[PDB]
Short mmCIF file of C-alpha atoms and ligand atoms in Angstrom, two decimals:
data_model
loop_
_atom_site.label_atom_id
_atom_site.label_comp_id
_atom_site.label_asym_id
_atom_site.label_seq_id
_atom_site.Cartn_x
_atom_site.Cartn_y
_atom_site.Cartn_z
CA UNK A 18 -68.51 -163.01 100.39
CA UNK A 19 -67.06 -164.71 97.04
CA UNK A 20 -64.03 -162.90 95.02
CA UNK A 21 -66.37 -163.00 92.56
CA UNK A 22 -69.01 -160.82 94.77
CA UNK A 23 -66.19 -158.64 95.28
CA UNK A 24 -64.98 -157.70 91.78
CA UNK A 25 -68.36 -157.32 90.89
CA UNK A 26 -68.96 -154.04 93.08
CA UNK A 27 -66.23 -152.37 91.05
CA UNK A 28 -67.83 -153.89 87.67
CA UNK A 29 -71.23 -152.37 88.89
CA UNK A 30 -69.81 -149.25 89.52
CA UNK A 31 -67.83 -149.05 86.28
CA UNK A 32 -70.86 -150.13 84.35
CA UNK A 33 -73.61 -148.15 85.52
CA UNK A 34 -71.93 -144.98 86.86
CA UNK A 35 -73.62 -141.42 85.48
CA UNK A 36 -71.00 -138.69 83.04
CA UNK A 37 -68.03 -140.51 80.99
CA UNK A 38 -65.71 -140.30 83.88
CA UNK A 39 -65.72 -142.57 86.77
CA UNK A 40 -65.38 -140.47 90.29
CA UNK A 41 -62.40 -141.41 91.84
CA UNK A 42 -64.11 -141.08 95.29
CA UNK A 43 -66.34 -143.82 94.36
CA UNK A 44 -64.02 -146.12 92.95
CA UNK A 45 -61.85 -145.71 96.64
CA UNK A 46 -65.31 -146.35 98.65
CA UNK A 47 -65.62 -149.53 96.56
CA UNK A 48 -61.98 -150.90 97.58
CA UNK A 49 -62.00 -150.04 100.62
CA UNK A 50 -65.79 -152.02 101.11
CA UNK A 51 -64.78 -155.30 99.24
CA UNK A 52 -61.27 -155.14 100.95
CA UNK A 53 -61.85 -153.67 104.41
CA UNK A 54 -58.83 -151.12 104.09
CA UNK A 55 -58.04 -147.51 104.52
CA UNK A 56 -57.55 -146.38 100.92
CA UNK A 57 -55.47 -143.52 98.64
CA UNK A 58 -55.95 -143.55 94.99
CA UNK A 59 -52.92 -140.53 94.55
CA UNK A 60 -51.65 -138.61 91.24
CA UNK A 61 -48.02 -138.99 90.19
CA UNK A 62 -47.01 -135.95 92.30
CA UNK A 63 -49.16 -137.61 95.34
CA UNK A 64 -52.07 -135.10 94.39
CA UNK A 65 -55.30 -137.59 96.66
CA UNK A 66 -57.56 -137.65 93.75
CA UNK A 67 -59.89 -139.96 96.00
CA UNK A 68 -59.59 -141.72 99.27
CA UNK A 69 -62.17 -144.09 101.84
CA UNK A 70 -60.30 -143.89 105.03
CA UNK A 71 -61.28 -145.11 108.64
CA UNK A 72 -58.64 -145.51 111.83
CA UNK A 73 -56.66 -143.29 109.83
CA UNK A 74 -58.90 -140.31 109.87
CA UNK A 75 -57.72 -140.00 114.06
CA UNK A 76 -54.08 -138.51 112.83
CA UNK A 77 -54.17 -135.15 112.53
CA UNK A 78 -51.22 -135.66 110.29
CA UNK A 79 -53.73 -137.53 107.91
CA UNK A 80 -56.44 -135.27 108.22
CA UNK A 81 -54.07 -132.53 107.24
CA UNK A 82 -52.63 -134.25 104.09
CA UNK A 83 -56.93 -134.11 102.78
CA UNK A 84 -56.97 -130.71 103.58
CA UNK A 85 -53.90 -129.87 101.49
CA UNK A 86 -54.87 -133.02 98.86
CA UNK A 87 -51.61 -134.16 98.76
CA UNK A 88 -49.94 -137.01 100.59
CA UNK A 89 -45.99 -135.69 101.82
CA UNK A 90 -43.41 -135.58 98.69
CA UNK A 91 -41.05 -137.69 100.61
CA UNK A 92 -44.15 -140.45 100.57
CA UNK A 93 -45.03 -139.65 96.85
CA UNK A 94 -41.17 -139.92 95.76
CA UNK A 95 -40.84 -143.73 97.81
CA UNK A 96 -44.31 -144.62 95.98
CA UNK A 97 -42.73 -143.51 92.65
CA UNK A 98 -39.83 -145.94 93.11
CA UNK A 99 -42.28 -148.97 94.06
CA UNK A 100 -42.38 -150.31 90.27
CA UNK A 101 -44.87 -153.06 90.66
CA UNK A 102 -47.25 -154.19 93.27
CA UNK A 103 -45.79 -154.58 97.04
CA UNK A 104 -47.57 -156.15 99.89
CA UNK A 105 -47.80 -156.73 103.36
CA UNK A 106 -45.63 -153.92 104.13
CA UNK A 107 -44.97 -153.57 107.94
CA UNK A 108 -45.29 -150.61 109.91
CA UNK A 109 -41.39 -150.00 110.43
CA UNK A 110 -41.15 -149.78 106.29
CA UNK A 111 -41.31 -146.54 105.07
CA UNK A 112 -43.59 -147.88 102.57
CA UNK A 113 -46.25 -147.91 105.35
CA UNK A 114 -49.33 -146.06 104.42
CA UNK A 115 -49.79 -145.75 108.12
CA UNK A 116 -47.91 -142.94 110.38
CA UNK A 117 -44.69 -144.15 112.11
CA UNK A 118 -45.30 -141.97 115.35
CA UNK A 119 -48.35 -143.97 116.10
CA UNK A 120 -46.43 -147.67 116.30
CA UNK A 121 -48.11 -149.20 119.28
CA UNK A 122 -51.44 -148.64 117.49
CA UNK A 123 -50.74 -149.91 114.02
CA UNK A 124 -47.86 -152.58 114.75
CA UNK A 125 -49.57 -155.22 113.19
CA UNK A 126 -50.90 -153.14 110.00
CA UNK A 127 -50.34 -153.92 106.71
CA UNK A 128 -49.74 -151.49 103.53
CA UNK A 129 -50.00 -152.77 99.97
CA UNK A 130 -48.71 -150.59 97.11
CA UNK A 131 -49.93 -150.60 93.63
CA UNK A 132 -48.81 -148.82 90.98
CA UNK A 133 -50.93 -147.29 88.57
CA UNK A 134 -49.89 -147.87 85.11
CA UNK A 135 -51.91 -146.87 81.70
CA UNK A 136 -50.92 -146.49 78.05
CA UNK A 137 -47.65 -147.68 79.05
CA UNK A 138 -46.75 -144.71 81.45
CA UNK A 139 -46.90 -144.85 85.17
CA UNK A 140 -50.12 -142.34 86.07
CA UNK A 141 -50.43 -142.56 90.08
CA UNK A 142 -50.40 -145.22 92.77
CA UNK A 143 -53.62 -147.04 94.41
CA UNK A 144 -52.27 -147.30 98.22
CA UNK A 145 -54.36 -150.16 100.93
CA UNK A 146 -53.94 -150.16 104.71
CA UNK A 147 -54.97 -152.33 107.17
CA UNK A 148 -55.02 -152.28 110.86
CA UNK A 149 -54.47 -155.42 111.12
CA UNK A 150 -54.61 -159.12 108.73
CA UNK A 151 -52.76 -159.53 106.05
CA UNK A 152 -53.26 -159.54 102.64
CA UNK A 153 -54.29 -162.49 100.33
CA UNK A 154 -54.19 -163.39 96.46
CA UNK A 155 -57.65 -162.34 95.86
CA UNK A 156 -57.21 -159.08 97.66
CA UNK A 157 -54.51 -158.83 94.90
CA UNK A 158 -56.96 -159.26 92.25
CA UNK A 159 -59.17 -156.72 93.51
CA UNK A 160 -56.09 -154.20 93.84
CA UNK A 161 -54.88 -155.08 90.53
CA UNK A 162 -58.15 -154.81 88.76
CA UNK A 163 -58.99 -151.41 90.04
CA UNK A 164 -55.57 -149.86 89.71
CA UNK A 165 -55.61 -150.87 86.29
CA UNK A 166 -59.04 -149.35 85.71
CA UNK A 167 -57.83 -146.22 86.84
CA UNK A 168 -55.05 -146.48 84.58
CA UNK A 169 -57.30 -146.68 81.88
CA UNK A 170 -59.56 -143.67 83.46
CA UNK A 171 -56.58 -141.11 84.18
CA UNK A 172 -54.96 -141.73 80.51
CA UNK A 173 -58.01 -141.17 78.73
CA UNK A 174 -58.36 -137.88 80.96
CA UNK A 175 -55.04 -136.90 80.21
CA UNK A 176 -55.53 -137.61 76.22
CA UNK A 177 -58.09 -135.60 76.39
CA UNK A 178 -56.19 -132.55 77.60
CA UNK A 179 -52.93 -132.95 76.02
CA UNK A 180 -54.93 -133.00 72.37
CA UNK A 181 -56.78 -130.40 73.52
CA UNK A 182 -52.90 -128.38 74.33
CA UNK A 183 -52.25 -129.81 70.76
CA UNK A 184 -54.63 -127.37 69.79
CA UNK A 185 -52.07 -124.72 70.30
CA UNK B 18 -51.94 -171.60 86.76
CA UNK B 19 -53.16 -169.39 89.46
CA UNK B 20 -56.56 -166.07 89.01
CA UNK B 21 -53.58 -163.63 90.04
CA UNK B 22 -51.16 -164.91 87.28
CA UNK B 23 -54.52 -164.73 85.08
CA UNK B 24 -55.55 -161.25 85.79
CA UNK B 25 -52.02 -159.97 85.22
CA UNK B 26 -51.50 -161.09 81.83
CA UNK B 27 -54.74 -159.30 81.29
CA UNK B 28 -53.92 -156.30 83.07
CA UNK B 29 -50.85 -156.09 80.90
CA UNK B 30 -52.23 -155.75 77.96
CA UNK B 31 -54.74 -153.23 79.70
CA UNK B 32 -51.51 -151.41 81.02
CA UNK B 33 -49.20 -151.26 78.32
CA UNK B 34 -50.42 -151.43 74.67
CA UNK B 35 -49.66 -148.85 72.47
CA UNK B 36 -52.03 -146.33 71.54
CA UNK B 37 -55.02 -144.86 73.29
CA UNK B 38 -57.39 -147.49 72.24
CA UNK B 39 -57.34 -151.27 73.93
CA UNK B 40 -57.57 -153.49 70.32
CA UNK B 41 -60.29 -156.22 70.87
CA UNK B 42 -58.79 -158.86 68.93
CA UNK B 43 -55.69 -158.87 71.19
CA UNK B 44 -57.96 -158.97 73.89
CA UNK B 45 -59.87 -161.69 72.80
CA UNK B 46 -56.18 -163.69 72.28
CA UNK B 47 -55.62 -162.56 76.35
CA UNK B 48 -59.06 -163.89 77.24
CA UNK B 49 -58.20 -167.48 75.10
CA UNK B 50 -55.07 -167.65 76.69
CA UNK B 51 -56.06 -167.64 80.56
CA UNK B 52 -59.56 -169.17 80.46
CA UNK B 53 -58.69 -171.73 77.63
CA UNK B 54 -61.67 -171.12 75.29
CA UNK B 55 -62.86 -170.02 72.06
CA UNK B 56 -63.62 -166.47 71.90
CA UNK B 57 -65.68 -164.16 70.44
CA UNK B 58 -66.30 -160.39 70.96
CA UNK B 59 -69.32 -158.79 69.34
CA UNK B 60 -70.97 -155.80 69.00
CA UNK B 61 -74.84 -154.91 69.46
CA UNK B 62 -75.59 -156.15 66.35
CA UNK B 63 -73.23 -159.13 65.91
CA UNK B 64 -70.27 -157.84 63.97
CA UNK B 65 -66.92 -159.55 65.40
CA UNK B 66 -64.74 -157.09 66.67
CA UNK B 67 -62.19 -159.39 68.44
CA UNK B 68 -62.18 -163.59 67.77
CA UNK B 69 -60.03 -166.25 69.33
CA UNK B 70 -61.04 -169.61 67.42
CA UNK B 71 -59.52 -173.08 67.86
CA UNK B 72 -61.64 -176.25 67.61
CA UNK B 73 -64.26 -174.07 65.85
CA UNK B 74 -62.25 -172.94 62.95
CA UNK B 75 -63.20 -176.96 61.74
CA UNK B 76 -66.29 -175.67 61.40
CA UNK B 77 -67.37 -174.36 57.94
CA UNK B 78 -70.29 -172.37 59.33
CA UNK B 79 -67.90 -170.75 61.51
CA UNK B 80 -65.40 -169.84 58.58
CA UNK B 81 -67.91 -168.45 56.97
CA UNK B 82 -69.18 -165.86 60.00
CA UNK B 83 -65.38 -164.90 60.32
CA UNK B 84 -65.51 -164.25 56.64
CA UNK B 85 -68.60 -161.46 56.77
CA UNK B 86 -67.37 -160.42 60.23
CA UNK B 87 -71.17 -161.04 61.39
CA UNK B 88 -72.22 -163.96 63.92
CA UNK B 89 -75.93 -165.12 62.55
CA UNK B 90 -78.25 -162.27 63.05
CA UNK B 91 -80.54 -164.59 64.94
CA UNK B 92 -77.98 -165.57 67.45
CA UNK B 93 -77.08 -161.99 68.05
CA UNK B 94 -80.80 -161.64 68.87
CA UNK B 95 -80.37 -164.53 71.13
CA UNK B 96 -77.28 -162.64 72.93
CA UNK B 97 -79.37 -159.60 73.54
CA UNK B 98 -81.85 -161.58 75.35
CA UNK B 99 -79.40 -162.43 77.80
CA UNK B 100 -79.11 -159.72 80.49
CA UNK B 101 -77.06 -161.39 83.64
CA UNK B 102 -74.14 -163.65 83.20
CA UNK B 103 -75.77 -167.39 81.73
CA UNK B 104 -72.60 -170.12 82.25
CA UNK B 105 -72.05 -173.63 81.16
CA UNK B 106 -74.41 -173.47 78.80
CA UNK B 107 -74.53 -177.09 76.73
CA UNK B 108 -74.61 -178.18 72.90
CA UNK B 109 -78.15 -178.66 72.76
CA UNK B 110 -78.99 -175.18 74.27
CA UNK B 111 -80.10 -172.39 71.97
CA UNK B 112 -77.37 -170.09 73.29
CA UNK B 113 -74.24 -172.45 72.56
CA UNK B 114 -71.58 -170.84 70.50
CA UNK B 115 -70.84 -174.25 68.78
CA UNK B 116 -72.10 -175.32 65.93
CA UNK B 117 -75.45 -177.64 66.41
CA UNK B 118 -74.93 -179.65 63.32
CA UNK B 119 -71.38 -180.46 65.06
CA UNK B 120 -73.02 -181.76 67.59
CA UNK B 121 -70.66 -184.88 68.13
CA UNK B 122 -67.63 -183.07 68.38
CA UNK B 123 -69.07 -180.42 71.34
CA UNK B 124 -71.05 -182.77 72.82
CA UNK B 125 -69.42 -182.38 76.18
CA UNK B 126 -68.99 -178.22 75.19
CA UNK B 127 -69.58 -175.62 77.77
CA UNK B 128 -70.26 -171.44 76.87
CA UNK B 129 -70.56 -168.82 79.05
CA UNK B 130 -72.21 -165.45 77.86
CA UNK B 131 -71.22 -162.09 79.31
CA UNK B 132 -72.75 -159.01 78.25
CA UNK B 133 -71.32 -156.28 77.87
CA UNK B 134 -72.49 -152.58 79.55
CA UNK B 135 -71.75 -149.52 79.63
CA UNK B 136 -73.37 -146.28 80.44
CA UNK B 137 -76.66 -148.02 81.67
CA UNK B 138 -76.44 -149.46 77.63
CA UNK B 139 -75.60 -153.05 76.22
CA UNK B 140 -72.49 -152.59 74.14
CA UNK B 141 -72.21 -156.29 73.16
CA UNK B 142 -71.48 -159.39 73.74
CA UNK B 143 -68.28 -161.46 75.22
CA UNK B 144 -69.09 -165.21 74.62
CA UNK B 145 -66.71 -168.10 75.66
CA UNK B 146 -66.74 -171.08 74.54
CA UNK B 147 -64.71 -174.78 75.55
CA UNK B 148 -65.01 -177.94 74.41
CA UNK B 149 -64.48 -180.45 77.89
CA UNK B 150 -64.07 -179.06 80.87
CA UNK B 151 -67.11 -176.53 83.11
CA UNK B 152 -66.64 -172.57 83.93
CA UNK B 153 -66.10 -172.12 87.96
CA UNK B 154 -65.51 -168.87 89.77
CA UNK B 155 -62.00 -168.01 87.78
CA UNK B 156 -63.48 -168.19 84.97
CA UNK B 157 -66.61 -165.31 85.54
CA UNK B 158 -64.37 -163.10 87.25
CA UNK B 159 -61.79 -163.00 84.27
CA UNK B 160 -64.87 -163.04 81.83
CA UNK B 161 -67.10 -160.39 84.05
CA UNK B 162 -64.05 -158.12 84.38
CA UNK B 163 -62.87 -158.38 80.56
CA UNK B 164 -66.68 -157.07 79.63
CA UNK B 165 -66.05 -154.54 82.21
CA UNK B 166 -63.28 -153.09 80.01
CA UNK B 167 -64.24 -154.17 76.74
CA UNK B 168 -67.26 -151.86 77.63
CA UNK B 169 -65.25 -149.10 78.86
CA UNK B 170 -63.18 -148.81 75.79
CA UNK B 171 -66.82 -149.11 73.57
CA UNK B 172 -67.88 -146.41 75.75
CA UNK B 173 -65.08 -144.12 74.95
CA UNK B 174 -64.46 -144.26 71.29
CA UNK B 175 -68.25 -143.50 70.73
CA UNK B 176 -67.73 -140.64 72.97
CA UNK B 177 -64.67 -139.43 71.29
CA UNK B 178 -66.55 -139.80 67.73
CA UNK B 179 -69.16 -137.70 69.05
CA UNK B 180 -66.36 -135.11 70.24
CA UNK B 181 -64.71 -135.51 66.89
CA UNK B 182 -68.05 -135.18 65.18
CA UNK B 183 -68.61 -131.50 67.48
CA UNK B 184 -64.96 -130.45 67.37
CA UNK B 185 -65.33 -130.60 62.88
CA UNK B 186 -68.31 -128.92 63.04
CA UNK B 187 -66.75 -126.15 65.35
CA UNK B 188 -63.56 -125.99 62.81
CA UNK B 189 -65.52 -125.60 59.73
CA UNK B 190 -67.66 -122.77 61.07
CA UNK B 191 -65.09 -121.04 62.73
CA UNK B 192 -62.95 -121.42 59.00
CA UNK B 193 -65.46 -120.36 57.06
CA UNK B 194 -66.81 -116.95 59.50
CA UNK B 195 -62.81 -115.90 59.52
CA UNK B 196 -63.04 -115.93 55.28
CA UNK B 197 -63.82 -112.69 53.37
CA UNK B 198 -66.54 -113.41 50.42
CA UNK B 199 -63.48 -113.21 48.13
CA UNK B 200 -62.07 -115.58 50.07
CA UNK B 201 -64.76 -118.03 50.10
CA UNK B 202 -65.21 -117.71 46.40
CA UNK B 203 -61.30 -117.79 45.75
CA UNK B 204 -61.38 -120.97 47.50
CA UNK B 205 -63.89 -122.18 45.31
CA UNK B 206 -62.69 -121.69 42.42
CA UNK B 207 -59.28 -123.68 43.70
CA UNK B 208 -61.48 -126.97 43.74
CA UNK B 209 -63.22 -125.76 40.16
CA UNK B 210 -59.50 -126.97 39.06
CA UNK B 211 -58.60 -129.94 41.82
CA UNK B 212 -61.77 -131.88 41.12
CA UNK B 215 -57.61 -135.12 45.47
CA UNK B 216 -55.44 -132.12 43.67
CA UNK B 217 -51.93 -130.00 43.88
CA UNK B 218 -50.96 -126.29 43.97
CA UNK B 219 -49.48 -124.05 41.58
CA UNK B 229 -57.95 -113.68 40.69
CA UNK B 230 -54.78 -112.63 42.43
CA UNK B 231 -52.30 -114.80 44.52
CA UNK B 232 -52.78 -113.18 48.28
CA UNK B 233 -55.95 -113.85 47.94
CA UNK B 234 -56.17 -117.71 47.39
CA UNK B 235 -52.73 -117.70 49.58
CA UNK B 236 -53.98 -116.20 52.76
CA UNK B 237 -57.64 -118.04 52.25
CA UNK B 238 -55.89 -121.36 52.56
CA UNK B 239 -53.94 -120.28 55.45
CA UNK B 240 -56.90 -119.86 57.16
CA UNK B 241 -58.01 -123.11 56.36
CA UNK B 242 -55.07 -124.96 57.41
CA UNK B 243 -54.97 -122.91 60.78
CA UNK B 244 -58.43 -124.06 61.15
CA UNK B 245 -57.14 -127.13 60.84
CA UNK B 246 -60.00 -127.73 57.77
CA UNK B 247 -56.92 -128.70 55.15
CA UNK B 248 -53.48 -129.52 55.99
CA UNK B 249 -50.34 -128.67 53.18
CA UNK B 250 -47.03 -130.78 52.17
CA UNK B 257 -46.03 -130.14 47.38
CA UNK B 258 -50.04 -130.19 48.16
CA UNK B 259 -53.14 -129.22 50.18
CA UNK B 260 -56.10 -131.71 51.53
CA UNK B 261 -59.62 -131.29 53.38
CA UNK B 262 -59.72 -133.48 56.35
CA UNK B 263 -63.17 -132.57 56.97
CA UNK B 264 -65.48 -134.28 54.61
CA UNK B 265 -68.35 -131.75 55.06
CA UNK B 266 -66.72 -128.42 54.57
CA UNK B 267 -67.40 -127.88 51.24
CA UNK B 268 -71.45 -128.24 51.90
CA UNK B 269 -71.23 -125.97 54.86
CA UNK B 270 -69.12 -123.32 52.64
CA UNK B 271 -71.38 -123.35 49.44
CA UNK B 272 -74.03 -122.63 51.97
CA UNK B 273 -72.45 -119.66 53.22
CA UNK B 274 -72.28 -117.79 50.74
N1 LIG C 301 -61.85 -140.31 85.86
C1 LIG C 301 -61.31 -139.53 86.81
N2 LIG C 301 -60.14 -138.82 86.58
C2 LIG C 301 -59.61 -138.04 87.57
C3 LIG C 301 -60.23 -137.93 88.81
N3 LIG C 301 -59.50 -137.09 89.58
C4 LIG C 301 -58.42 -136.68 88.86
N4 LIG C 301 -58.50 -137.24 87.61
C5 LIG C 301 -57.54 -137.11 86.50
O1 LIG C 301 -56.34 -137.68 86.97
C6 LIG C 301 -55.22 -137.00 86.43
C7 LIG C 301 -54.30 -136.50 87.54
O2 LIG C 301 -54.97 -135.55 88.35
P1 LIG C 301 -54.45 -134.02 88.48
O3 LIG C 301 -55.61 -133.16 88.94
O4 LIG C 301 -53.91 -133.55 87.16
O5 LIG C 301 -53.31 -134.01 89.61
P2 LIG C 301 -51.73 -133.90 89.32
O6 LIG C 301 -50.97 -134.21 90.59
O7 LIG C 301 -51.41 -132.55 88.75
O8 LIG C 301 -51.53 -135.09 88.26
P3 LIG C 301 -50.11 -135.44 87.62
O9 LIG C 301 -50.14 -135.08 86.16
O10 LIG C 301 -49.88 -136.93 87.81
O11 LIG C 301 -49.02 -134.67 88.34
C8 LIG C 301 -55.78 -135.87 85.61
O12 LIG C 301 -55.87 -136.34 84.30
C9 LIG C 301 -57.20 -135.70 86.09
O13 LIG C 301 -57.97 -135.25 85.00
C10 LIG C 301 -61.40 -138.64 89.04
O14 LIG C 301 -61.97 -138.56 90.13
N5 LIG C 301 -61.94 -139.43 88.04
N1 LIG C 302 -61.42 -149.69 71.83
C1 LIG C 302 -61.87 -150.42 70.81
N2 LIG C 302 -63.12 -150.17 70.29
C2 LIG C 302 -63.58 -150.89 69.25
C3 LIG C 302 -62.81 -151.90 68.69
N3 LIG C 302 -63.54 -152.44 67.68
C4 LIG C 302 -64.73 -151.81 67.59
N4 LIG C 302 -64.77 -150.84 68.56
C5 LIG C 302 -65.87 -149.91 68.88
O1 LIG C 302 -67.01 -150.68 69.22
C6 LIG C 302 -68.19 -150.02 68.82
C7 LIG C 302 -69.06 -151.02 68.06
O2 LIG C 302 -68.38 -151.43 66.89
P1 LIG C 302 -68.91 -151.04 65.41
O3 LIG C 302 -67.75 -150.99 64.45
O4 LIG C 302 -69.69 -149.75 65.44
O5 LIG C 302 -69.87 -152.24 64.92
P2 LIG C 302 -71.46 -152.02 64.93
O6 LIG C 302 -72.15 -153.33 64.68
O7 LIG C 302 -71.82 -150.96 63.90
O8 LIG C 302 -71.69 -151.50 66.43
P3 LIG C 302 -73.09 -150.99 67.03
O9 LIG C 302 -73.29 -149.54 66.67
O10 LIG C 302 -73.04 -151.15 68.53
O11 LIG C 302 -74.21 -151.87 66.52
C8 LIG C 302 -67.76 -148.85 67.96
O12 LIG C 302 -67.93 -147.67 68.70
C9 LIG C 302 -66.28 -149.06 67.70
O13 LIG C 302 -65.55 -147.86 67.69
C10 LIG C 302 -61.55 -152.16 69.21
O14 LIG C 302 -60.83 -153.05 68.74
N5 LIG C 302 -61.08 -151.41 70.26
C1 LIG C 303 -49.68 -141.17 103.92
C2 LIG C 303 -48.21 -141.15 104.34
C3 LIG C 303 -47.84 -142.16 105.44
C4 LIG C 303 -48.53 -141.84 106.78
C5 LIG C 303 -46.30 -142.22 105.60
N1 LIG C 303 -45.87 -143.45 106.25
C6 LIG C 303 -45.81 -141.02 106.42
O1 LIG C 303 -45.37 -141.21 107.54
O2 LIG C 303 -45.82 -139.85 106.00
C1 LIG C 304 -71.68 -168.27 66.58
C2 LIG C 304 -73.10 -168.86 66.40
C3 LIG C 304 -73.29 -170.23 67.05
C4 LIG C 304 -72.51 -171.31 66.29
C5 LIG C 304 -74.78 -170.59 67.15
N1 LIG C 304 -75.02 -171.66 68.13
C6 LIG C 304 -75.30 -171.04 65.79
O1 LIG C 304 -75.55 -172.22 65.56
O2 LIG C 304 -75.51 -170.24 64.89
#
């Protein structure tokens, strides 16, 4: 499947995709698809706003972090401080989107971390795991692309309701 | 020069600009810049809202679009004809952006045509255009991507015009139920003496009438007072 197949799942869904706001949830089904990953798309404050996980559904840890829609605020503060995009982070980072107790299982995995930036403020982070291979150029492009369309999604959100606290 | 070095000088336009709005002729300079071609941005019905022109500015044809802002209305028919990404499309092709009767100089030329969607709705049209050398996969992923956004930001000023266009609507009748008749005719009379006009029937009458208008947000005050809602004056007349 061509990088160009790829980003075009994301274009599809931005294009054709029902209401003036794209879902979240979609748009970290659609990574996780064209880049076979475990994916976060979190607020500033490490609120999930939408995630498409697999291996990492078996930690209870994870599975408790959805219930209470945040990832930890130790996590959230480390993923504040990453200031542009960092990849093939190993398992013995703290960086690792993957949980540290379970090291014999995800000792080869990979985390890349991308900041999400729009309107020239820094609006959440788009967060990729993999069990295993590393990560490439064009899965770069893919990251890239759809942190930056979130960017553009969560700003315009945000616009929206600080005018609408301009009102008072 | 590699697609990630590409995308990123996209993406930082997309990331950083100033404002809330993305301004198409900046991104048609981005697009120019990593794909190396001419490039044009239009609308639905052909107006240029973003150009990047090089070899075509020879062109007097060209100057002239530029000029009225308006690619020819029969190519902008042509555009909307196109539904899927068409690429290296040649000089003798109805669908080249070059110039036919400057034939010689694109000869070798190449354009690609990406629409633009949004919303299930063609929004325009991105069209690239070089002179030499043929589009490959870098090139439609830059160019498929940029209509992706260009589409995005379409989509959401015509959304926020139809906000604006509920939120005035909402401001004038809200303005205009809060006034007294007195009121209403006070304010009136204030614009039987301003026609744009300045300050300066008793005074806490006209006084607390335009407070209620500028709390409304209907006219804002400086020394002077202005409508910026074109349509309240129909909408009070009428309410009386
Ligand atoms: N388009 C889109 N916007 C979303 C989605 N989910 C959340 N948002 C927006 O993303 C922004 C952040 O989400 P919030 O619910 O405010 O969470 P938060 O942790 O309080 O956000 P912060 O202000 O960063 O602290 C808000 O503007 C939301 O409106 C989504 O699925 N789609
Ligand atoms: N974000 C952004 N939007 C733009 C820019 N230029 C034009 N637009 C929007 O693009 C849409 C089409 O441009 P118009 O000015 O309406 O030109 P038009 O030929 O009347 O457009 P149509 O109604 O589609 O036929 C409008 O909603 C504009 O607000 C720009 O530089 N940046
Ligand atoms: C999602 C957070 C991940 C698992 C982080 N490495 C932690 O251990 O908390
Ligand atoms: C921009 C329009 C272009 C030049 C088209 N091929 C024409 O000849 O009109």
């Amino acid at each position: 499947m061509s990088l160009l197949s790829k980003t075009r799942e994301l274009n599809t869904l931005l294009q054709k995709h029902k209401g003036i706001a794209v879902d979240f949830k979609d748009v970290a089904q659609t990574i996780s698809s064209v880049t076979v990953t475990n994916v976060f798309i979190v607020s500033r404050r490490g609120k999930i706003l939408g995630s498409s996980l697999n291996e990492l559904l078996k930690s209870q840890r994870i599975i408790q972090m959805l219930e209470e829609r945040h990832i930890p605020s130790e996590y959230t503060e480390r993923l504040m401080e990453v200031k542009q995009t960092e990849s093939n982070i190993d398992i013995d980072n703290v960086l690792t989107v993957f949980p540290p107790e379970n090291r014999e299982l995800f000792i080869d995995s990979r985390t890349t971390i991308f900041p999400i930036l729009g309107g020239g403020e820094r609006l959440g982070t788009l967060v990729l795991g993999r069990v295993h291979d590393d990560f490439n150029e064009n899965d770069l492009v893919l990251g890239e692309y759809a942190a930056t369309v979130i960017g553009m999604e969560i700003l315009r959100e945000k616009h929206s309701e600080v005018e609408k606290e301009a009102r008072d």
